[PDB]
Amino acid sequence: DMRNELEEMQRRADQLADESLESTRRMLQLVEESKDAGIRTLVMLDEQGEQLERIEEGMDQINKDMKEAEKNLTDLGK
Amino acid sequence: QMGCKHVKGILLYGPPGCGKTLLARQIGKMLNAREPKVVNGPEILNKYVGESEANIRKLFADAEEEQRRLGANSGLHIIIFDE
Numbered sequence A: 001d002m003r004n005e006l007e008e009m010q011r012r013a014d015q016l017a018d019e020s021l022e023s024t025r026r027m028l029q030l031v032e033e034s035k036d037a038g039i040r041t042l043v044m045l046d047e048q049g050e051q052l053e054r055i056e057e058g059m060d061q062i063n064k065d066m067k068e069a070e071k072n073l074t075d076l077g078k
Numbered sequence B: 001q002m003g004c005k006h007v008k009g010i011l012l013y014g015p016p017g018c019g020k021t022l023l024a025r026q027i028g029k030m031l032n033a034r035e036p037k038v039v040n041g042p043e044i045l046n047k048y049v050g051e052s053e054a055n056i057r058k059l060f061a062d063a064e065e066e067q068r069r070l071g072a073n074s075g076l077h078i079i080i081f082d083e
Ligand SMILES: Nc1ncnc2c1ncn2[C@@H]1O[C@H](COP(=O)(O)OP(=O)(O)OP(=O)(O)O)[C@@H](O)[C@H]1O
Pocket: B015, B016, B017, B018, B019, B020, B021, B022, B023
């Protein structure tokens, strides 16, 4: 009558982490810095676009003025 | 003045159908205190390592907290072990 039976106990392997808290924090800090740099680039790019738009009008005005002056001088000369 | 400490244990035994659970239920109903915690036999066992003992220890949390906070001006807590 040496017929034995058993029961079982369970253990849980550690969840997936303990490497997600050293590279993670550095990743977040770098992401924040990149976000700030992107915001600054946004602002600078908008300012540059405004300045180019401003330049356009003066360019067109000088072109028109020179063309009209040349035509007038030619007309009077002949 | 007498410097005595209260009793914290009662055991009831006898043959079947003689009025044990009835006594425990009526004692729980008599006292003006929090609702008693009742354990229905072997409800504490768990398949994981350590969880059975955590379950036994989670019964004595409110009592410890109230003893730490209110000291001697504290209520009564009743725990009933069935079987
Ligand atoms: N002294 C008593 N006076 C009145 N009713 C009683 C008394 N003893 C038993 N009874 C009746 O019998 C019922 C069953 O008794 P009880 O629940 O106390 O059994 P028990 O002693 O816990 O038995 P077991 O060992 O099977 O758990 C009660 O609900 C009640 O109706």
